[PDB]
């Protein structure tokens, strides 16, 4: 059985935002849905769900500010209007009870992001990174939106030694990133994808 | 309405020694409780339900208890691959609810200590070229933790840092940090030595260039 979220994406404050939660391999007439978001950084925050016979409840902070809905196959969450505070992950997570034992959220989806921000989407910036025998090389990241970046090392063969790091939201909004690799002695170069602005970069960091 | 209140908000414990995490219901739940560990990117994993008793395959290091409006989570045995957040959850109900989830609780896992190694990168020619530029440092695999200090022709520099430091290892507990410092190219080339101070304890390990 598994769980699967849709929909995120970077989206204007005020703009209505449906997330998709499509699930297999169970009945929603037997298992309660939840809707989690979680915040960068932050804590789990419980959004509302919806029981095998159709109630749905919110918490108190969300009464008035999501829907939440079904078919037999999906649970949709709308968000009615978006904030800069409600940028989260958001998950799809399923429960149950038995006689008096609660059996817990013992299935979630991997979750997907949404970002709200009045800025356009934008893709990185990448600067080389280089000392001034073997040596470290890297690649900083700059100026993205909406998260996330991939970065690999040739294509994702060079694995070993490599170091990347947590990202940091700057003043601007923007993101960024480090990735640093060791290596031997040829060409050493990051590659920088950033699929929510359909754009990869490849820098080569010249010794 | 229906509040969890979680405590403490970090612990930590040697490796092989025991953690204990507690929850306080405002009100009588009933031992409908759950237990979560999570992990950097993601989702939580169910650890224990009904208040006390084990998710499958979940090992028993893990401990839940209490009843009524008091429970706590006991983590034995601690590993490496324990340093995660935890979090309690009730599932009393679904009305009234200002959070079902406590705020979580830290676990940082103290393996064997390791010395960071230390380094630094100039801005490359490409960024002083747009106005700005970011200097670099990174302390690479280390335990407990750091502090850095950046230094421009030896005054303490105190604006434009930020500091991105990385989960646990899972198999050995230790970190790595980047740091950075930002400066205008102008702020930039009005200076000539720039050093990263990275210190541990009392002992110190420090990186510069001259621009």
């Known amino acids: 059985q598994s769980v699967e979220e849709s929909g995120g994406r970077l989206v204007t404050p005020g703009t209505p935002l449906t997330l998709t939660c499509t699930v297999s391999?169970?009945?929603?007439?037997?298992?309660?849905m939840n809707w989690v978001r979680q915040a960068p950084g932050k804590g789990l925050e419980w959004i509302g769900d919806?029981?095998?016979?159709?109630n749905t409840y919110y918490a108190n902070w969300a009464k008035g500010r999501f829907t939440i809905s079904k078919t037999s196959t999906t649970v949709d969450l709308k968000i009615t209007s978006p904030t800069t505070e409600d940028t989260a992950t958001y998950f799809c997570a399923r429960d149950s009870w038995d006689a008096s034992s609660y059996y817990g959220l013992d299935l979630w989806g991997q979750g997907t992001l949404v970002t709200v921000s009045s800025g356009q989407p934008k893709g990185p910036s990448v600067f080389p990174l280089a000392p001034c025998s073997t040596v470290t090389l890297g690649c900083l990241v700059k100026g993205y939106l909406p998260e996330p970046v991939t970065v690999t090392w040739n294509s994702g063969t060079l694995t070993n030694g490599v170091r990347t790091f947590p990202s940091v939201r700057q003043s601007s909004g923007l993101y960024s990133l480090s990735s640093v690799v060791s290596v031997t002695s040829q060409p050493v170069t990051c590659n920088v994808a950033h699929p929510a602005t359909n754009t990869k970069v490849d820098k080569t960091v010249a010794p | 309405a229906i509040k969890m209140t979680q405590t403490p908000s970090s612990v930590s414990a040697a490796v092989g020694g025991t953690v204990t995490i507690n929850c306080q219901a405002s009100e009588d739940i009933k031992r409908y409780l759950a237990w979560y560990q999570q992990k950097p990117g993601q989702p939580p994993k169910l650890l224990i339900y009904?208040?006390?008793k084990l998710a499958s395959g979940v090992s028993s290091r893990f401990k839940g208890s209490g009843s009524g409006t008091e429970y706590t989570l006991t983590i034995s045995g601690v590993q490496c691959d324990d340093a995660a957040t935890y979090y309690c959850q009730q599932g009393y109900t679904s009305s009234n609810v200002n959070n079902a989830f406590g705020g979580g609780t830290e676990v940082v896992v103290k393996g064997d200590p390791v010395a960071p190694t230390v380094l630094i990168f100039p801005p490359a020619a490409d960024q002083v070229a747009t106005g700005t530029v970011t200097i670099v440092c990174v302390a690479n695999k280390y335990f407990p933790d750091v502090t850095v200090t950046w230094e421009v022709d030896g005054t303490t520099q105190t604006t434009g840092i930020e500091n991105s430091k990385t989960p646990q290892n899972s198999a050995d507990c230790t970190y790595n940090l980047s740091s950075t410092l930002t400066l205008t190219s102008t702020q930039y080339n009005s200076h000539k030595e720039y050093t990263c101070k990275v210190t541990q304890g009392t002992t110190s390990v420090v990186q510069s260039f001259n621009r």
């Open positions: 919806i029981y095998t016979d159709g």
């Open positions: 391999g169970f009945s929603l007439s037997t298992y309660t």
């Open positions: 009904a208040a006390s």
